[model samples]
Target: PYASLTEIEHLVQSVCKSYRETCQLRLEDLLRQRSNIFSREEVTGYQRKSMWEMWERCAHHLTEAIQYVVEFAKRLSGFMELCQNDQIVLLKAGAMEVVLVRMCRAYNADNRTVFFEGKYGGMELFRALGCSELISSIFDFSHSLSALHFSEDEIALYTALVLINAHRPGLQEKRKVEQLQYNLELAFHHHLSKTHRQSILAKLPPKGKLRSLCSQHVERLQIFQHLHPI
Candidate 1:
């Protein structure tokens, strides 16, 4: 393979670093940006906020999440060698999965909360969004992943594998993408073996939960847009 294990690891760190830089919200950064941090606990507080307003806040982060995925794929060295057409299709299909997978970075296990903007909030904070099932799926997925406590390198490789093997439809160079996937799969196999979590890597994502979440998310996207059309 053109990329050795070490080279892949280096790219993993770099890629994860760039992504966390944009995605993680620091206290200082949150103060400066001043995005609203909402975490209400009771029915009275919930009454004050409109449902779509809450949805807007949650949805805004999704656009930010999608941007980082696009930026991240651009930096994967092997990804650059892919045909631009395939790259576009691969990203379109894989972006939501990455976004879901990346939630662990912001999950707060200690408080049973999610860190968005400057605040860590529980289910009640998001109740107004109207997709209770999907939100619960997201939190449980994040909880299960955070419970594993995978290190940054492991997490890095995990995200990489999703896009590397996402294997989009209409791939113009499927064989070439397969070859790239070979080294990435190797990286996951070897790297995790040293750490002895190869089994977890085998079950890295719950595809059914993630797939259902994405399918339902797409449903809400259209529903919300129809109501708030530009």
Candidate 2:
């Protein structure tokens, strides 16, 4: 019944699809260059230089891709927040006459008008009963508290755990943080402890790439420090 307005929620899904595709393409492009002469040991010194230059280009593309994905996620979350706030306002006002009217206009303007009948009408009636505030408050509170507030030490620890657990692939939760730390210590002992820790560092492409690029961005860092003054 409310399927039309509910379907509009897939706007977030579309953004997610776009983000994932972009990320996968960028990663695939990087991996494709890996065993090639441009990234391999067989290349001449000049070719090695050119390969590193190409790698830097890929790194820039990666940075832009990551930024776009993050921005899209932020925008999607913002839209979800607005929808939530609108629900709250509907609850506080009662009857949803105001809310349904606004949502109808919004859905129409956004070209999702097909969702305007039946189930959506029922959803409006349900939300108007004022019981929705509990759900709304929970979402609002969760969003407010989700922001990263880690100290530098925590950040370093988290980053280390991420690097150490890179072999595992996929999300690690707060509950698993200790296990991840242990795995990271094991990996550090097995791999990163050798070669002045440089070659082993290569396994951590994200961190290695970030450190390398940031080192080259010393001028920007100097300006940043000047502005913030420690």
Candidate 3:
């Protein structure tokens, strides 16, 4: 869950406006005319510049926005692939709690943690690709959840819900959803001996609200109930 569509559009506009100066500067440079080919004299004219440095300069001067566009395209492509693969891996592991249970079991010396090197190192596929800081944060979050004795599936479900929330439509009014998400994050910190009721409430704007509503509606059989009262 997240902010409503209007809210998100507004937020994007706000962010854009906040950085308008830098954006306009970059846009000007991006739209400026430039040539690709540099003669040896032009290249050798800068002996202080390394080959890689020269290449970067040429790419930036020549391609400009096209370079950024290509980079973004590749990153987005990789992100999508990584997300889909993560789903498969988590499903195969039978969810987060199960993975944690397995970890606990393997953490025991008698259980032999040697079989899967990646599992022991927390360097699984998605973890490897999900950004360095993100992977670290995930492990930190997981260790806390594991300590809480959360079931593997429960952990997986919780994380999956967060990921899926990105796809949700209406989100601003979902307090319960916001609370649950806040609670899970709080639990992680609590398990680590950190402050618990910190209210993650800053300007998060109840992004998880729609997710909560959807979950509540499903659990309560709202559709069925509306169609045929028991």
Candidate 4:
């Protein structure tokens, strides 16, 4: 167990900083580069083809990010001590949600556009791809998350809490995981209280809300797969 909340905060921040450095090329950068890669004429001539290519690139990057996050979890002192099955379970359940939250950083709510890997597109494109509802939900989620104005440290601690507390089958030491989660939650509340003068505790959205938004994204991804056959 950590000797103090300060100790846990330091460890969490270090892990988050390392992970961010390792995954430096975010989805927005890739998207911007992709947009500039082709001429307007080329994009017009092969609209769907370009979309397909962009989707493939985005998928590849997302996969890499997920893998890196798993690697990050494996390096966590508490996480590394978990049983192998529990480790797998936590990674499998939390990785997608983590990616979703990270991607929220790329959301441009003013334009209602989302930055996928190698491309940024608005609801029209996603609607055409049969994900209008999902895109809207994501926009809302990002808007709310942004409103919270979490600091880097807060984001890191919250992410760790989410990853550690994911409820899934086959957890070997559920109680221990819960205990870790409780400690993280305490640390998060303490940090928030110190940083914000507002009633953030009352203003913050429910924990399940973010998880639900992530699940919706998964559903949207499935819909995209069925429509695009990839």
Candidate 5:
């Protein structure tokens, strides 16, 4: 039998909490590495070996973050119950957005910089890799997100919302997915109402806008991957 609404809420919260802890651990491990030792001269000179090595390290952390997102989706009771194909669609559609949300803590809007492991860089590093607008857009999104003052639990709930709320072109069980998505929204609303009050709701951008921003970031990530082949 499927879980009841209260049970589903409990399950989602538990899964999100566990995933949040896992993400924190992964980030801590990533950040423990020594800072990148490359001098500006080495980086700007386009030393292929050094540049590849540096980006490869960043790529590894990104891969780990995505893996955790997969784990997060798998752990969701609502997600696991979906037909396999729909499950794949939802995961594929939302994975990048979830990754961006998960990595929000690493973005420092005031500094206009992003940190990977212990090394930090501005948009110039990403521009060198053929990412220009994408990097700037992400910083802007992160800046908006930071203004919301979301707690760790809120971030987890928002990630769950993103994962379940995807609108892929084909869904074998569209109604079922929508039902699940609705429940997640109610969960988020209840959480915010209890902790943040109703005013925060007005402060949030429309859901469509959030999706648009995430889609743009995913496109940029694809472009970067194609250019760099990593």
Candidate 6:
């Protein structure tokens, strides 16, 4: 509330641009060892890699994705203003949700595949990971979001909304976080008003689905640890 909503909009736009600059995931290198675009079925059994191979590759990418998200959060105007405790807590809780939303950017709705690493990876390519439900859910979320054809500004604003959570557990300045969220909601609504894109917000909140999906990711991660004991 220190500045006008215009300042908020400009901040989002500038940060989003900066995020793209800061995140150079070297996806070509990341995807170089992964299964290719056509490796979507059990029929392609040519490669006899261990299940852990795919699992390890996935974990690598997941870690990178998480790191990139954290970088983006740091670029947000008000994010650093929060308590260090709250900042870490908020990122711990909200990083995955924002990552999931950000996934749509590289998603190709036609093929139901995510342009991860190098190729557009289809569902079967990740079958060995044994998190079909979670993987498929990610695809579905990306698909729906991509269908909206969100502009860069809208994505940036929504990203701001996702990260500035007023409702995470373990937050020290709980009320402060809420007000931060409220401020973005207003700025977000103002932008949506201009584009008549308000309906997407109605569709956006997993409020519940987000939490459930996030916990599911953890469960899958736990499954990996159990199987590999690493």
Model 2, global lDDT: 0.31
Query: Cα lDDT of all candidates, in order?
Result: 0.70, 0.31, 0.32, 0.64, 0.69, 0.73
- For model 1 the TM-score comes to 0.80
For residues 96-202, what per-residue lDDT tens digits would candidate 1 score against the true structure?
88888877767776666776545556776666667788788778888888877776666666777677764567789888778877776776677778778877855
lDDT of 5 by residue, 1-230 (tens): 44466865685577567667667454444344324433576446433445456456657777888888898888765788899999988887787778877666666555665664446566665434454676677787777776776666777777887888747777889988988877777777767776755576677656676678778866755664675667
- Over all chains combined, what TM-score does candidate 4 have? 0.74
Candidate 4, 1-230: lDDT as tens digits: 55486775666566557556545465436445433333445444334555566556556777787877777666655787788888888886787777766655666545656554345555554332334577677778777776665555655666776688836668889987877677666666666666663365576567678768767777766664675654
Q: Model 4, poorest ten-residue lDDT window?
A: 30-39
Cα lDDT of model 3 by residue, 56-114, tens digit: 44234323423332232222212234344443432322222222222332221222111
Best by lDDT: 6
Model 3 bad stretches (over 4 Å): 48-230
For candidate 4, the lDDT comes to: 0.64
**TM-score winner, 1 or 5:** 1
Error in Å for residue 197 of model 3: 40
Clashing pairs in 4: 31-118, 31-119
List runs of model 2 lying over 4 Å from the truth. 1-12, 20-42, 45-59, 79-230
Mind giving the per-residue lDDT tens digits that candidate 2 earns over 1-230? 12243343343244334334433223234323333222123223323344334334334543453444334333322223333434233222221111111121112112112121121111222232223443243233222222332222222222333322322323223234334345434433433333244343433324333333333333332453454433
Colliding residue pairs in candidate 5: none
lDDT for model 6: 0.73
Question: Model 1: number of clashes?
Answer: 0
Cα RMSD for predicted model 4: 4.3
Candidate 1 vs candidate 5: the lDDT winner is 1
Q: Number of backbone collisions per candidate, in order?
A: 0, 5, 10, 2, 0, 0
RMSD of each: 4.2, 25.6, 24.3, 4.3, 4.2, 4.1
True-structure RMSD for candidate 3: 24.3
